[PDB]
Amino acid sequence: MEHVAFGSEDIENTLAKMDDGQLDGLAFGAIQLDGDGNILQYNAAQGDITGRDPKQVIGKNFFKDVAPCTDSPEFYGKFKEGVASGNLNTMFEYTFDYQMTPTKVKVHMKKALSGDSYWVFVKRV
Ligand SMILES: *C(=O)/C=C\c1ccc(O)cc1
């Protein structure tokens, strides 16, 4: 394992050092998005929750293609405001239900240390 706790105050500093292989060692799902919602990184734990193959969704748009159940003011809406503002740090519960058994999760969205990249962290609840 990579020991990093979900919701940690400095998590963006910690994950700045990880290559895709290290992200696969986290205890929770991790997705890196650009400012347009395109998927830059997607880890193994996220594929285990949603059944998506990580290598197959890199490059796709999260909100438009992969995860349209998040295309809502409660999720996408918060993301877009955060990108527009250049600051994002929010946690909420959500249900993932697109082409899968409905799965209640905790979502943590946070701006990355780098310019135009954003993290989505996910864990089961
Ligand atoms: C809502 O769209 C649920 C499905 C889904 C699929 C993949 C990811 O990563 C999140 C949500």
Curated annotation (Swiss-Prot):
SMART domains: PAS. It comes from the Bacteria. GO terms for biological process: phototransduction; regulation of DNA-templated transcription. The modification S-(4-hydroxycinnamyl)cysteine is found at C69. The keyword Hydrolase does not apply. Pfam families: PAS (PF00989). The 4-hydroxycinnamic acid (p-coumaric acid) chromophore is covalently bound via a thioester linkage. GO terms for molecular function: identical protein binding; photoreceptor activity. Keywords: Chromophore, Photoreceptor protein, Receptor, Sensory transduction. The keyword Transport does not apply. Coiled coil: none annotated. SUPFAM superfamilies: PYP-like sensor domain (PAS domain) (SSF55785). Residues 23-86 form the PAS domain. Belongs to the photoactive yellow protein family. Photoactive blue light protein. Probably functions as a photoreceptor for a negative phototaxis response. Monomer. This is Photoactive yellow protein.
